[PDB]
Amino acid sequence: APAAVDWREKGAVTPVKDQGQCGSCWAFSTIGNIEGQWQVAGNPLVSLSEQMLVSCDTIDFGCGGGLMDNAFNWIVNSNGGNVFTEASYPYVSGNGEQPQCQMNGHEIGAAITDHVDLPQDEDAIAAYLAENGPLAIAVDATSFMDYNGGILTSCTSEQLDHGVLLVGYNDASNPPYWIIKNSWSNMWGEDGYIRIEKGTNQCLMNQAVSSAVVG
Ligand SMILES: *[C@H](CS(=O)(=O)c1ccccc1)[C@H](CCc1ccccc1)NC(=O)[C@H](Cc1ccccc1)NC(=O)N1CCOCC1
């Protein structure tokens, strides 16, 4: 594994989004991972549709919550592997509205075939990230609620309750850190991102790391 990687610099990460007043973090985590896997496979970066998941994934609960594992399963087993573009199916649940599922002639932005789980092992996660692109992860978000910048070192690490996107790390820092894309707009945190220390399982970040498989 290299000393640092930042997939934003490598072209695999779309702008920061805003889930709004909807518990759809799990959909943003899933979609962010697919956006990265699709780009790393050699396709142009394209923003994909969280709304598709919020409205159409019948395993998960829309704004009531969900799991990235379920969302990847729904895409593959119920939507033919297809993921619609954000342009085709824009996000409208930010004020809590939850319209019926559309499905119908939507532009297909990406396709996946499966998903994989990573071990609860920060070194293995870093190596896989560096080779393969941004990863869906779960965290305890308790300490995110009052984040105002810098690197967390004493994150509350009690119970997973939020899905986010792991986009990089930097070991050449006191302390080493992960770089995480949140879905609370670009006004939150460090332009929508948070850094947490790497190597002390901050916020339970190692516990539920996954990635879609393209091709
Ligand atoms: C998204 C997290 S958040 O940013 O909205 C948030 C909210 C409150 C505290 C901390 C973070 C989402 C919020 C769900 C919600 C809905 C209404 C009111 C309050 C909270 N969280 C989830 O969807 C979590 C994500 C998760 C992913 C992977 C592992 C563990 C958790 N999942 C979740 O709540 N469930 C999935 C399983 O079934 C029931 C609930």
Side-chain angles (χ1 to χ4, degrees):
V5 71
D6 185 345
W7 283 102
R8 301 172 293 183
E9 294 180 344
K10 301 183 145 269
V13 187
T14 66
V16 173
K17 306 185 185 181
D18 188 2
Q19 72 189 62
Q21 294 309 303
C22 176
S24 52
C25 56
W26 59 272
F28 288 83
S29 177
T30 304
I31 291 295
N33 164 256
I34 299 171
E35 285 170 348
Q37 296 299 294
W38 188 247
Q39 191 277 334
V40 171
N43 302 287
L45 184 67
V46 59
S47 289
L48 300 171
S49 178
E50 290 82 8
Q51 194 67 54
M52 174 197 70
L53 291 173
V54 171
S55 298
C56 306
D57 164 1
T58 52
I59 308 176
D60 296 301
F61 311 114
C63 295
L67 298 172
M68 297 77 82
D69 186 68
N70 292 337
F72 291 128
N73 277 330
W74 180 84
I75 290 166
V76 172
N77 296 323
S78 295
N79 206 226
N82 290 150
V83 184
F84 307 135
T85 63
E86 187 184 281
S88 75
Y89 202 154
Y91 191 74
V92 296
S93 289
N95 298 320
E97 293 303 312
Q98 295 187 81
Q100 86 187 304
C101 185
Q102 289 177 193
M103 303 175 45
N104 234 314
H106 299 94
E107 180 193 8
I108 298 163
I112 65 166
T113 63
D114 201 356
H115 68 288
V116 293
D117 289 294
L118 280 75
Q120 304 182 150
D121 192 304
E122 286 184 85
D123 285 350
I125 292 158
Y128 191 98
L129 174 70
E131 185 67 9
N132 295 308
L135 303 177
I137 74 170
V139 297
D140 186 332
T142 299
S143 300
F144 284 40
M145 299 303 170
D146 296 286
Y147 180 65
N148 322 133
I151 301 161
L152 301 192
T153 72
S154 195
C155 190
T156 297
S157 306
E158 291 172 355
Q159 170 61 51
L160 298 174
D161 67 1
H162 184 26
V164 292
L165 185 70
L166 187 64
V167 301
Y169 64 90
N170 184 190
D171 286 0
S173 173
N174 297 134
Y177 59 84
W178 295 113
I179 306 167
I180 292 165
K181 189 187 191 190
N182 202 1
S183 53
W184 297 355
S185 89
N186 65 45
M187 304 296 284
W188 177 84
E190 293 180 338
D191 300 306
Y193 292 78
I194 177 168
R195 292 178 291 160
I196 70 181
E197 180 165 359
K198 172 168 174 287
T200 59
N201 200 21
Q202 288 294 289
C203 322
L204 301 178
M205 67 77 60
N206 76 10
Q207 288 198 340
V209 180
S210 66
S211 186
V213 177
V214 171

